[PDB]
Assembly symmetry: C3
Homo-oligomer: 559 residues x 3
Amino acid sequence: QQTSFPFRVCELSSHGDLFRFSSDIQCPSFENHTEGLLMVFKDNIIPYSFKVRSYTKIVTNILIYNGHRADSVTNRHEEKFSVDSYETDQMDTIYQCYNAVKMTKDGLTRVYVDRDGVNITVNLKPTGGLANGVRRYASQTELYDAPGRVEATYRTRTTVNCLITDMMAKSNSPFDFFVTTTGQTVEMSPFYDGKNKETFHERADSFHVRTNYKIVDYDNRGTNPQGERRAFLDKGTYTLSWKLENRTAYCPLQHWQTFDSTIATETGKSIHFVTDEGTSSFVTNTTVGIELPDAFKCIEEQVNKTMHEKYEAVQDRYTKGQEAITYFITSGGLLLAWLPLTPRSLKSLGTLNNPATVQIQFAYDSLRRQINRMLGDLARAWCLEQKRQNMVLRELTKINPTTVMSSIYGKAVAAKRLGDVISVSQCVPVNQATVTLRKSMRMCYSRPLVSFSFTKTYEGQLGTDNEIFATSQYYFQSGNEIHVYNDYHHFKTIELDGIATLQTFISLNTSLIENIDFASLELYSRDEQRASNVFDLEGIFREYNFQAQNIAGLRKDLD
Amino acid sequence: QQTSFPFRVCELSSHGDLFRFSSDIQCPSFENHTEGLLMVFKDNIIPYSFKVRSYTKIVTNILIYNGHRADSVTNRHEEKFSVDSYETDQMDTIYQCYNAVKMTKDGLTRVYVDRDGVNITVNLKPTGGLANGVRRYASQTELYDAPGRVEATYRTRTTVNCLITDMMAKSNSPFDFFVTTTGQTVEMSPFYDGKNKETFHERADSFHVRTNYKIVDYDNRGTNPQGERRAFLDKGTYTLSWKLENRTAYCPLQHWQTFDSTIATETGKSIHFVTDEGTSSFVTNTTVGIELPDAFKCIEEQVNKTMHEKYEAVQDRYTKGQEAITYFITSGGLLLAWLPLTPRSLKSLGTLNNPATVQIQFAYDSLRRQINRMLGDLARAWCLEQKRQNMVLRELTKINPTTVMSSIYGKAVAAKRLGDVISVSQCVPVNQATVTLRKSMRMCYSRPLVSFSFTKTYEGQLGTDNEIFATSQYYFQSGNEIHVYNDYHHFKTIELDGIATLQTFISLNTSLIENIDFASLELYSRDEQRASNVFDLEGIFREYNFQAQNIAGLRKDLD
Amino acid sequence: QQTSFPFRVCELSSHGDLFRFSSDIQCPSFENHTEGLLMVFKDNIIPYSFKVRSYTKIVTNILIYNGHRADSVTNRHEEKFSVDSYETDQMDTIYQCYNAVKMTKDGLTRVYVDRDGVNITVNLKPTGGLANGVRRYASQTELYDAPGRVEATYRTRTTVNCLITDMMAKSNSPFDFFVTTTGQTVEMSPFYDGKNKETFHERADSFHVRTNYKIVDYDNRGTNPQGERRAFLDKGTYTLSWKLENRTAYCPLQHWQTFDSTIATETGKSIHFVTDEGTSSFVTNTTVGIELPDAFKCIEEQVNKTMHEKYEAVQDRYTKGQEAITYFITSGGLLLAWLPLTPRSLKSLGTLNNPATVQIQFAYDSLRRQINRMLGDLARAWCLEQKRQNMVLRELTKINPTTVMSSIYGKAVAAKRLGDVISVSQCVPVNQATVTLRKSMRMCYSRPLVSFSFTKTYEGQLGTDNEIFATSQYYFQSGNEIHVYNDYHHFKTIELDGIATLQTFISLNTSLIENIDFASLELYSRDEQRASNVFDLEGIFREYNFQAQNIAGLRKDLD
Ligand SMILES: *[C@@H]1O[C@H](CO)[C@@H](O)[C@H](O)[C@H]1NC(C)=O
Ligand SMILES: *[C@@H]1O[C@H](CO)[C@@H](O)[C@H](O)[C@H]1NC(C)=O
Ligand SMILES: *[C@@H]1O[C@H](CO)[C@@H](O)[C@H](O)[C@H]1NC(C)=O
Ligand SMILES: *[C@@H]1O[C@H](CO)[C@@H](O)[C@H](O)[C@H]1NC(C)=O
Ligand SMILES: *[C@@H]1O[C@H](CO)[C@@H](O)[C@H](O)[C@H]1NC(C)=O
Ligand SMILES: *[C@@H]1O[C@H](CO)[C@@H](O)[C@H](O)[C@H]1NC(C)=O
Ligand SMILES: *[C@@H]1O[C@H](CO)[C@@H](O)[C@H](O)[C@H]1NC(C)=O
Ligand SMILES: *[C@@H]1O[C@H](CO)[C@@H](O)[C@H](O)[C@H]1NC(C)=O
Ligand SMILES: *[C@@H]1O[C@H](CO)[C@@H](O)[C@H](O)[C@H]1NC(C)=O
């Protein structure tokens, strides 16, 4: 950086060395982006959801006592049975069933019938229900509970009701079971039939499927509809049916975002798909490795309907680069569908839930493209400055080659100029101890005389930089101080720091980037999320169970 | 960039063209921020929550058998009835009720009384309960179950218990229903009365509201309290009451963050509200468009209490810019309240849950302000460099106008100097084929002679850059090589690449910004979140339902 | 910036002032990072989870009617009792129990036995269950329900079943209670014994612990196993046991990430732990303040096993800086374990759930290190440019000190050169009103004559910049226009803007950073999260409760 010029004696070039001025500067200089159509999908988390019908006969017995002043109902007992096919299907079409219910236990037969009367046919009429909840049809909305006519006696009254409920059920992959709106569980895939690989944990022979099945809504009661494939299941206390869709009904991933104009920018490791609209950028570990998906075929349709709309609605300035679409997988588990456009002449994928990554990736990807393009101009514009700083030197040498030389080099040197060529040598510094100045200057010497040694003495003349070889006021430099000379005769000697020094240095007051400790914030804490339900799962159960145990303590004493 | 100087003959200016040196450089140069008080609110997600009282008489009958060696309890049957107003209100004030229960079914009357005895008045005393759960008062904590006195006979014992439960209920907007701690559901708004637009799906006449109602805590039993408006609801197996608040009780959005010093910075599209403390920045699509909210009036109070504290606690160096506060909506669904300060003389808003956006927006907004301010200094400081690079040229021309000229231009040119003005022309290049050098230099020529053509021949002298018009050692340039001249006589000819070339070019070894593939990370996965509950909703139900179906299979044989 | 040179008369230096050229430039110049092993932990949110065994005898009575044509089952009543120790432990070892059940109510004894027969010993054999759910052993999988033999009569049949269930329970800190797979709740810590500070809300004497207890799996029935400490609890309708672990079994925080090579970089406020692999950076409010944790001792083991592997697998180029490990807490509630390596010779912590912070912190921390290192080169490289722009001036003064001087200063000045020293003065501007040029130039004057005042007149010669003291064509500058002089005689007068002006200014076409409004996006909304469960908590309850209230309305008429 900084450079000492000892008092150097330099009346010596033995054509040391020589360099030329490059007739001209040789300016050293210092990414490939294809527009395309981006479309990203994510893992889908909404469980597969479908309509289910359930059927069931409810049998209630009330024990009713006929006292002398009033009556007491002393017990009520309600049991719910399944419904056989012969009558599931009067229910599905005409909406009639029987008011009776049969079974066999150890060979003996048990039977229940409405009002302890006879087994007849009845209609299921609609009943009321929740704003927007399951819909039911029942056959006896009245409970049979009339005191026998003899005072001081118990009579037991039977009532039977056929109940159909329409509601929906949900199942999650890999489809081991499903659950109906009202809380019922079924241990099997909604997609299972005889012989399917689909999962099945129910009785082997409580399941069966009907073909060209005729279900009708209560409002097309007695209409002949199209016919469908229906599953039927017996669960002891009810029967369940639903329509038998293939497993293709359900789709693993779902469409997240679709990006009109996006630039795919290639690198070593990966490819960055930056989109300006989504203000985000998807990176994939691919290096050109375009895939084709297998068990995600569920997407083809929409994936290629949308590409068609995009393409067509921009079709004029652009042509297709790949004839087909290709597939990429994000590190965060997103799935990219992409086809690039060139100009015309002039199982699960395991999505992480961190939407921030792709936008950070975009801040930084963006501030990169912008800093780097301004750095390129620093280059060009700065290169021009050198191209002329060069020439200028070529000139300045012609004045005095030496200084100009020392300067560029960065050390005490000396040189002569031999035409189109400059010849630099090296100097050898004289005694810093013995270096002495002389008073006189006698025509006159524009430069003072001085004498010095190395072991005997010599006599010489002072150059600028402390080099050595009417009304007259001049000033001169020496080792660590200046000299005042009136009329070619010495006057006084001021120090290097006495005479004011002029700075010419354009300050580049560029200040550097701060540290900033980024604050940790959240929109919603966990408690806030927990407290966000109306159903106190814990409250409702813990008190339920507490009360329960209290009544159970009544069954006995506690010493 | 790079520039060929053919061997050009240029003893010709027909006062081609002339330019002056701008007596001085004309330096081209290259946002408005108002401090204010920021305060952001979010969508609130904690459901509206209030105290509820429920009331109910429980009737149990036990069937108790008196055997000869021991007794068996063969049935237990428990039914829960609502409570009429005449007695809801002994309960609320004195805490007494009846041990009896009446009703009419098909004109006939049924009645139950404790211990099958007489209808009297009883006290409800406090019972035990969960650490911190619902509080109850009961009237018969004992169950009546004593064998009749005759051996080998069934007797049926009635016990009745009045039960009050204090607990809380929760309701979510738009308030279609609510649910009490213990799991009970009510199909209506907690804010509904006769004639209100509030939602109501219960029986029209099971609901009613009391005015100046007197409820007292068991500990101010028999105190005359203030009186309040209370809802009363009959749900068949219980009555429910709660205090009748207006719907203003509940608030859609809640206070998130409040920011002491924040700078609002305006743009084309939007306004950026950057805060240094929150280390974040809220952007709004407004362009000055300050709003005033309508159904969020719930905020006014706190919003303007806090502004008052802020203002006052900084009131001296600052004055109010708007006299009122104004309202803004973030793209991420936050709601900004803001009033700017100037110095003194010297339905839902749909919050997204992505806390990252505003901090990314702030990283980049920040690195922008910082890069751009350092780029401004590059400007000023670099402009100074040109201001002096200018002057320097004005000088250097005076030495030899030509080179200095070619240089700035970027092509072979030639010029004379006419006082304060320079006159540039254009040259015409001679034969590159026929260009020949001469041996002699005989006073002497400081420049060698050479002859050349265009079709006949001419004879001339070599200029620097290959232009054309005692102990003597000099060196000279020619097309693609140098010439050694001893004593004004040619010696040898070395090539352009034989003699070492000196570089003067300050290297600007600025390296550009890396690519960095940002990693995809999460703090907590989904499984981790799912596994985070103690209640296995699925476990508790699926086994519940399995067991259930097992007992149901016992009702019959299975061939 | 811009500078007026009035027509200034400057034949006056009274050795005004003088400055020297710093023999050389004095170049002003403009963070400490230690590699180490990072390892971060988070708050753990998976509740403590352990195996539980429950035991219980179920007593059912069926009321079975024997009609003349068929039989009716008119009631069923099932009660569940706990199991005493004398027989809990036949169950745990041999898997036999009694088919009978006893109790005392008000001194009187009640008893139930299977099939209303005699009290014997029975085996509990395995039963079936859910794919992968709780496992049970039962003793009577058959229900006793056989019509008495007399026509038109009720008989009541008793059946008793002993049931053991193996399942698991979960408890959350601070461990106030726990819940078993099937929905049962227990009001106490799973870690409680006599005298422990652990929490206990059950009966004081229903709890007890066995020592060297012998439980065996049904498959090592009658094997003598090791023996263990077991809790036993009576809950009225069942007994529960589990193994009695210490509370150390459970750990508050869990291991999140572990980082091979990471650089810890110190600042004023904080320390930044940046890791290149995790592409993230953890900041801590510490300032060297290394902690040691207290109730997180659960980590020591793994924390220091992993440090050992890391260390050893890089042990050669690195040595340990601290002999022990030290502990830090992130602002986002992460807990850093860290030990730094130097080269060899050549309660809860409250984790926030915002994974984005540490990566933003890293984008910006990174773009800082990179911008700042390129800014350092701007410095060095730009400093060199000044170092030579300096020297060049030292030269150019020797041509004409004045202009060179005015230039560097930035105002009209004038100077002479006194050897190694330059002496600057100040000038005094003459009349802008009265400033007049003369026609002649008669040997000749290379500069025209002009006369001017201040109040009387004077006569003088024009300098460059408007200063004042055969075939001849020259051109000259004056106040706001130029002058054409043919043969030392005036010709015409063109304006400052008539003659074309040459620009030499290297354009630094650096453009500044854009604003970018960052888009607000989420991967999964709330509805999407809510809709993601199969169990409609609300559906299953609201319809449950609706139906319930419907049957309750049957108990009476409604005028
Ligand atoms: C009721 O009658 C129908 C028609 O004969 C028959 O299929 C059904 O089994 C009968 N049910 C009972 C309970 O006897
Ligand atoms: C399921 O398979 C059957 C027969 O192969 C077909 O008729 C039905 O439409 C399929 N479902 C779909 C939508 O592919
Ligand atoms: C001037 O430059 C230095 C380093 O180059 C820096 O420390 C300082 O902050 C700068 N000042 C301003 C106001 O930019
Ligand atoms: C019990 O007595 C009170 C007081 O006369 C009365 O209001 C109530 O209806 C009676 N209840 C029954 C169950 O008879
Ligand atoms: C609700 O309205 C009533 C009467 O207009 C009023 O007395 C009551 O205080 C209101 N609630 C509030 C807090 O505005
Ligand atoms: C030197 O500069 C070039 C381009 O200007 C760049 O490729 C290289 O990385 C730089 N070297 C260093 C060490 O900064
Ligand atoms: C059944 O017998 C065993 C063995 O004597 C005894 O411990 C138990 O109390 C008896 N149980 C009943 C219900 O009598
Ligand atoms: C719990 O404490 C007991 C006795 O002090 C000990 O035997 C047992 O192993 C402890 N548990 C652990 C794993 O520290
Ligand atoms: C040229 O520079 C100016 C300011 O220095 C800027 O406004 C403009 O965008 C630049 N042009 C380009 C193409 O970089």
